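Can you give me the bound-state structure? Components:
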Amino acid sequence: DWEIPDGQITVGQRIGGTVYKGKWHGDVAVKMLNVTAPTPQQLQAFKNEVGVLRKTRHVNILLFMGYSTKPQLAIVTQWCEGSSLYHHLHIIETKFEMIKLIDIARQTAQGMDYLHAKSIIHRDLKSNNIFLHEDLTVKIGDFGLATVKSRWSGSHQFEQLSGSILWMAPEVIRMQDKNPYSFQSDVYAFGIVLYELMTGQLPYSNINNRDQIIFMVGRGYLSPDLSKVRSNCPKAMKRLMAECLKKKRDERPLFPQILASIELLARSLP
Amino acid sequence: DWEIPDGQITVGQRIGTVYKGKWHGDVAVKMLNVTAPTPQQLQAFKNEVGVLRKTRHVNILLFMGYSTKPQLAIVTQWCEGSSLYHHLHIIETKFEMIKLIDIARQTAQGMDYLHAKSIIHRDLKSNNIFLHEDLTVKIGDFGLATVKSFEQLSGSILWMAPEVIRMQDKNPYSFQSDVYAFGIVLYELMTGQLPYSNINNRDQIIFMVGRGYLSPDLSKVRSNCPKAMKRLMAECLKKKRDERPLFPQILASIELLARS
Amino acid sequence: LKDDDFEKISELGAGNGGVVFKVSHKPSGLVMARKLIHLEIKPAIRNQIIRELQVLHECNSPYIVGFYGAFYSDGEISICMEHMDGGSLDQVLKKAGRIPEQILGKVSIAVIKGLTYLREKHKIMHRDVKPSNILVNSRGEIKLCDFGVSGQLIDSMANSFVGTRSYMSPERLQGTHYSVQSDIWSMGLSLVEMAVGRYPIPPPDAKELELMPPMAIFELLDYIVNEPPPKLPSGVFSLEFQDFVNKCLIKNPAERADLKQLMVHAFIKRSDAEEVDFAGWLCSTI
Amino acid sequence: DDFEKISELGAGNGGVVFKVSHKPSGLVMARKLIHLEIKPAIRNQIIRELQVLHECNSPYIVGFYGAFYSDGEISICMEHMDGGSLDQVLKKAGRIPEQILGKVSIAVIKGLTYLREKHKIMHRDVKPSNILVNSRGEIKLCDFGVSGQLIDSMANSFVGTRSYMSPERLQGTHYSVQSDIWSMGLSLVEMAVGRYPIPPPDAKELELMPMAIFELLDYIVNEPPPKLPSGVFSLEFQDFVNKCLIKNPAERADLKQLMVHAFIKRSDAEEVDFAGWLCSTIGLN
Ligand SMILES: Nc1ncnc2c1ncn2[C@@H]1O[C@H](COP(=O)(O)OP(=O)(O)CP(=O)(O)O)[C@@H](O)[C@H]1O
Ligand SMILES: Nc1ncnc2c1ncn2[C@@H]1O[C@H](COP(=O)(O)OP(=O)(O)CP(=O)(O)O)[C@@H](O)[C@H]1O
Ligand SMILES: C[C@H](O)CONC(=O)c1oc2c(F)cncc2c1Nc1ccc(I)cc1F
Ligand SMILES: C[C@H](O)CONC(=O)c1oc2c(F)cncc2c1Nc1ccc(I)cc1F
Ligand SMILES: [Mg+2]
Ligand SMILES: [Mg+2]
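Here's the bound-state model for the whole set.
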């Protein structure tokens, strides 16, 4: 069991539910539900998020360490030194070599492959939730929207669409099915990550109308401008990016195939 | 459940009962190559896993899963880099004092974690402390580890506490015994040597450390080791079990010291 | 202004990407509203956002919420502004159920003057008109807030989380057009929401209109773009009011009334001339 | 590489032994792998030091072919003995006839003398498993401390389950070949009775014919030495064994004195079908 008896955790600074840097057998990350009266909906959220993390043990999934109930509801995970991929790419504009960028792609794919293999759909994959730990190891985090595929189609029910729009697949945005999420929706998000990696910029930089992007992407009018990939981007990557980004979800590759594409690419340079 | 279905793990280069494998990337597989699982070998495996499943800490080797069906096997992360033994004693890596203290600190961090979960490691030594990517300590090999509630004595003599060697107490292993092991590790870190170098008889070391006659030679510590660290080594190596600190206090002392 | 300068009094509310606190600015003693908007942004653009917000120091109107200053700390741009103890018309509409056509008249004037003020004296359109962005106070003032003054902040906010509804004009949704004409539509839609007391998209069914799982946002946007605009119920509202919202809600921006035309509208002439204890109505409904 | 594995001869503490053949030669030998993680200057020193084994020529010393390093382990290629160790033989015979122990005793004394006089080295590790035998009936000493550096590197080791260490070596005082006589003596009692003679057998346990290692070390240092029983063994044998097992190395027999003991003079005269006895006990018959 992974319940941390009350008192042991020592909450400190803040970063961005809400996330603090704390102390429990070393530096840890503590993610809390600030409030005082947890609604049974916030409760099932917590129960579910813990449920998913419990099933993960892989070097590219951020390490779940345990949870607390009594003070506030909280999830404890490893602390990371170093920044998110978002921060490297769009804030400090780190000048990674192309072999490194490919490797970040590779590791991110590795973590996703591992999740899908245990039937977890992350549902909130994006630059910010990909940490370059010690600048050397990709750890995928934030499992606040993560879910496990149910064998039965009627367990789903109603969930209000949430998430960052730049990484949402058209079918997710449209939100026409009972369950529009799939392994393939995660791939699309990873597709946008390839975009940030191979271009250095977020998609749709000329458009600043939030509702317009939701509407145009869901409709098929809008899609990332692949011409903006930097010139050192291997042709295989550009193709692989365009494939992950296909509008027809079933046309997207899954993570073993994505992993293979990147290995085969890697095999091609001296 | 953490059982990996037969068919997925693919074993490779041996290292020796541990191989490099592929299962969702590089892993390390520790196998038991005998197709006759002794009912005691199956018990061994059962407990090592049962111990490992309790661990989720950045300074403990990441357990990923187990397999039974081609063979008994334990899957854990694959660490690039070398063990603390290899660094200190083979390639004689010239760590700076801050890095030594940092290795001591992280080691303590992991030991602290194990203890808080009532796990006694019982085989803590240089060889079993891996410097992952040359910077993070990953305490490995849990083949003797037990959860604190006859056993033929087993281990490496240089890290054994005199009560462990003696095997005369009702409970010869204790949190404090792990601390002794730790003290020897401290020793290696602060001298770059193994203890008892002037003595090359295994049975003499066994007998003389047990009797209480023999003890690491503290003159050998590097001139740049802080008085406070040298003191901590002393307290950890204390012959009298109950006079040794527990890992909360050790961590405290090292974190405190490290600031100077 | 800086983060240490402040003491938290209470949380005035929160939205999609921002949080608002009633605070006491320690040096001056002033009570102000502090809005924090989370952004991960380059120092060069955060400083450009601050610098561009400094234009609000000159924005002085009784239809525009006041500006005390702006800064960036930790991971968040702070905008410090005139505290409005009456809240947003969103908050009000919750307690009041429906807002009386006569009060909405004052609101309609306030919005137009404010949109005019912004347009003429500061070259900018609002972008985001809706009940939660019209703020009212004890002295009976109706002011506009959260308008698009820093162009850089607009840009930095585009990487955002998904909303649950929308007041965006159809022409903007289609990238077909972009002007004040779009802020007029949003005022129109707001009014219908405030009049009927329920977000007008989609329109209420035959039964539901007698009394008086939510549609996903993509469906809302698809509605706005492809369906006829909402409208006021037949009898409960004056013909002048019904006509007013209608000219605000015409799909084609060209054919849509402008600020000059709206200002001299039957509904505006009437309401301007009416005298209403707005401040009184407000405190009485809280 | 160039050695084909034929079988495993067995393993003990930090080492394993295979019977192999050199692929082109067809030369059968015993290859011992000793597991060591050591500095490269130190593996070279060990391998160099093992080379003095080429200077060892005695029908009481196992032959040596070569030594080298590979894959974190030292290989010692040495004469294959098809009879294995007396440890191995003891298991299948139960006890070893006194008369046969006479021949072993001579071999061990002769062997320890040769090592002493011709190379100035003591064995350091006499026990039944390091007395190897063959079908030609020779009896040879193995695993003796020729490389001083290998001695040093083997200290960092796992705990054993028993010990044939002389009390003086245990307490760290002066020691010499006197230590080796103690171990031979201790091994002789084991092989005669068929039980590791520490501690000495109970009343019940005896009529038919574990213990922590620290207890055993402590017995060796503070209790009286074991002995044969009387009546079922020759008096000379009992006298011989006792003179080997005296706790004071200085009152203990030496090599010159054992060589002319009554038990030795006798067995040397005796003509015994040793090779026949062995093949009988194991696997050529
Ligand atoms: N100057 C002010 N004085 C008093 N209350 C204020 C205020 N500014 C904002 N508020 C309150 O804070 C709440 C949160 O405002 P914010 O602009 O962050 O979200 P919002 O309600 O406008 C919806 P969205 O974030 O989607 O545009 C508003 O509902 C409003 O009632
Ligand atoms: N040259 C040789 N020919 C045949 N068999 C040999 C041999 N050298 C060693 N052996 C056998 O291999 C076995 C293992 O050798 P090793 O010396 O490693 O173990 P050991 O029995 O001496 C236990 P320990 O390592 O504790 O002293 C021995 O018991 C011996 O029978
Ligand atoms: C979702 C956001 O979190 C809340 O909504 N948007 C804003 O608050 C907002 O959007 C802006 C923009 F696009 C350009 N310049 C300023 C602002 C501004 N804040 C703001 C504006 C005027 C005043 I007076 C007070 C304010 F807080
Ligand atoms: C680690 C093993 O399980 C235990 O056996 N120990 C040895 O075999 C051994 O320990 C040694 C030492 F300390 C110095 N020099 C040589 C040796 C030697 N081996 C050896 C000696 C002679 C001959 I001929 C053949 C050998 F293999
Ligand atoms: Mg607002
Ligand atoms: Mg041997």
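A couple of observations. Residues D 9-13, 15, 17, 30, 32, 62, 78-81, 84-85, 87-88, 129-130, 132, 142-143, 160 surround ACP (ligand 2) (CB under 6 Å). DSSP finds eight helices and eight strands in chain A.
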